[PDB]
Design an enzyme around this catalytic site. Sequence first.
Site, PDB file in Angstrom:
ATOM      1  N   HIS A  18     -31.156 -14.603 -11.695  1.00 28.29           N
ATOM      2  CA  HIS A  18     -31.395 -15.940 -12.221  1.00 28.29           C
ATOM      3  C   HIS A  18     -30.492 -16.356 -13.416  1.00 28.29           C
ATOM      4  O   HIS A  18     -29.445 -15.748 -13.700  1.00 28.29           O
ATOM      5  CB  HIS A  18     -32.893 -16.100 -12.591  1.00 28.29           C
ATOM      6  N   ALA A  20     -31.949 -18.655 -17.049  1.00 27.36           N
ATOM      7  CA  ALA A  20     -33.082 -19.244 -17.788  1.00 27.36           C
ATOM      8  C   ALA A  20     -33.253 -20.772 -17.666  1.00 27.36           C
ATOM      9  O   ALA A  20     -34.391 -21.264 -17.730  1.00 27.36           O
ATOM     10  CB  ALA A  20     -33.008 -18.851 -19.255  1.00 27.36           C
ATOM     11  N   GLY A  22     -32.791 -22.639 -15.032  1.00 26.07           N
ATOM     12  CA  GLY A  22     -33.338 -22.952 -13.720  1.00 26.07           C
ATOM     13  C   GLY A  22     -32.340 -22.612 -12.638  1.00 26.07           C
ATOM     14  O   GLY A  22     -32.678 -22.623 -11.451  1.00 26.07           O
ATOM     15  N   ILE A  24     -30.025 -20.304 -10.275  1.00 24.67           N
ATOM     16  CA  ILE A  24     -30.270 -19.058  -9.556  1.00 24.67           C
ATOM     17  C   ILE A  24     -29.014 -18.608  -8.808  1.00 24.67           C
ATOM     18  O   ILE A  24     -28.358 -19.415  -8.139  1.00 24.67           O
ATOM     19  CB  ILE A  24     -31.533 -19.101  -8.669  1.00 24.67           C
ATOM     20  N   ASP A 127     -22.202 -17.653 -26.005  1.00 25.64           N
ATOM     21  CA  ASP A 127     -23.328 -17.027 -25.284  1.00 25.64           C
ATOM     22  C   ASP A 127     -23.030 -15.585 -24.735  1.00 25.64           C
ATOM     23  O   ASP A 127     -23.686 -15.127 -23.811  1.00 25.64           O
ATOM     24  CB  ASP A 127     -23.861 -17.954 -24.167  1.00 25.64           C
TER      25      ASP A 127
HETATM   26  C1  LIG Z   1     -25.160 -13.689 -14.975  1.00 21.76           C
HETATM   27  O1  LIG Z   1     -24.900 -14.753 -14.077  1.00 21.76           O
HETATM   28  C2  LIG Z   1     -23.813 -14.623 -13.182  1.00 21.76           C
HETATM   29  C3  LIG Z   1     -23.798 -13.562 -12.272  1.00 21.76           C
HETATM   30  C4  LIG Z   1     -22.785 -13.425 -11.332  1.00 21.76           C
HETATM   31  C5  LIG Z   1     -22.726 -12.231 -10.394  1.00 21.76           C
HETATM   32  C6  LIG Z   1     -21.657 -11.912  -9.545  1.00 21.76           C
HETATM   33  N1  LIG Z   1     -21.980 -10.790  -8.884  1.00 21.76           N
HETATM   34  C7  LIG Z   1     -23.220 -10.384  -9.303  1.00 21.76           C
HETATM   35  C8  LIG Z   1     -24.026  -9.246  -8.910  1.00 21.76           C
HETATM   36  C9  LIG Z   1     -25.338  -9.100  -9.473  1.00 21.76           C
HETATM   37  C10 LIG Z   1     -25.758 -10.113 -10.369  1.00 21.76           C
HETATM   38  N2  LIG Z   1     -27.014  -9.940 -11.025  1.00 21.76           N
HETATM   39  C11 LIG Z   1     -27.842 -11.001 -11.531  1.00 21.76           C
HETATM   40  C12 LIG Z   1     -27.116 -12.068 -12.310  1.00 21.76           C
HETATM   41  C13 LIG Z   1     -28.901 -10.407 -12.443  1.00 21.76           C
HETATM   42  N3  LIG Z   1     -24.925 -11.098 -10.697  1.00 21.76           N
HETATM   43  N4  LIG Z   1     -23.688 -11.237 -10.170  1.00 21.76           N
HETATM   44  C14 LIG Z   1     -21.757 -14.365 -11.336  1.00 21.76           C
HETATM   45  C15 LIG Z   1     -21.771 -15.446 -12.222  1.00 21.76           C
HETATM   46  C16 LIG Z   1     -22.800 -15.587 -13.154  1.00 21.76           C
HETATM   47  C17 LIG Z   1     -22.839 -16.820 -14.050  1.00 21.76           C
HETATM   48  N5  LIG Z   1     -23.903 -17.060 -14.964  1.00 21.76           N
HETATM   49  O2  LIG Z   1     -21.969 -17.667 -13.963  1.00 21.76           O
END
Ligand SMILES: COc1cc(-c2cnc3ccc(NC(C)C)nn23)ccc1C(N)=O
EC number: 2.7.11.1
Length: 385
Positions: A18, A20, A22, A24, A127
Amino acid sequence: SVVIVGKISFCPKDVLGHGAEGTIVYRGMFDNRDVAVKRILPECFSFADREVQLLRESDEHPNVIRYFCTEKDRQFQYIAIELCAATLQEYVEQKDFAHLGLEPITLLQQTTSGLAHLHSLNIVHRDLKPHNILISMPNAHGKIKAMISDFGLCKKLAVGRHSFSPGTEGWIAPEMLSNPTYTVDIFSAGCVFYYVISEGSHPFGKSLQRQANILLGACSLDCLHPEKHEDVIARELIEKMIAMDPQKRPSAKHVLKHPFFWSLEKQLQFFQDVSDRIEKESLDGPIVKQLERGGRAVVKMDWRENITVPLQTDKGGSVRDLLRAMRNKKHHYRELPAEVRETLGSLPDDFVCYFTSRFPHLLAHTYRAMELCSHERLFQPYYFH
Ligand SMILES: COc1cc(-c2cnc3ccc(NC(C)C)nn23)ccc1C(N)=O
């Protein structure tokens, strides 16, 4: 059933995690490429538009998440980004990833390199935290790397170097609450450094007390031993990075030059270069006196009685003479007996470690003392001038 907003496509069952706000993150695809699809809400459309543009400008760096495309429907905006193994939070909070054999200091070098690229482009992250630092998928040569990712809360500076007073609690710089600048990312980085090093801890305590503690400047780097060289060098950097005064914080390029990142060869080479720089050099000399200002304690009164029995047989309270001795034994290593090179060697790794274990304040003391020659051609690979 699957969601298709051409060329972006994801199955709603495949949720990575996610955001925070909203938002996902899902596992998906763009142009027959395995990507991570971010589904941002209509309220957050401003963030995504800032995010997508700043990424277009900086994703060419290897330590910055590769951005693919953005597509909107009648309800959401979707961001196709590079698909990674896990986050830094999952990496640290699950010691199964340990079998991946990743180097903590290297993840931090990669994270600081990514950040240093942003700062050069005049972009402040605002952040930076373990959730946003991602661990890449292993490439064909098995290599895994760290990357910067949540570009939503970024701010591009201009003529002047100031941001105005916002994030997720526990990792916010004190000045952003109370003018803020790139040093806000250095504070958040300092916290991230300790978190990976300590394998879970944070300078400002438990998740719920952290932000109240940052405001109070009440912190603890107690996972770091005062007489363990590895921990000592680490403390030096982290302490300056999490300084309550932004002016006292080192820049991203300053952090990358710190001994914390140096190889055992570099560590030894620094001791050669400094002891070569001293002599011809008189005691009255501002370089020798600055280096002598301290240990004594650094040298443990007599650096001869704490050394090995075969080496002592081969002034005794001088850091200048200890480093001169080190230079003489490194130079004349193969023209030295087997007995002394067995207790000291093998050069360079086990050689430098023989003294850094026995004198944990030697590199930390010499480094911030020798900062006087920060401008010199010889000391360009050690400091940021
Ligand atoms: C933190 O959020 C992001 C995550 C990813 C991303 C790319 N590969 C993966 C594999 C697992 C994973 N775990 C989740 C987020 C707990 N996230 N993720 C890519 C971009 C953002 C962003 N906020 O732009």
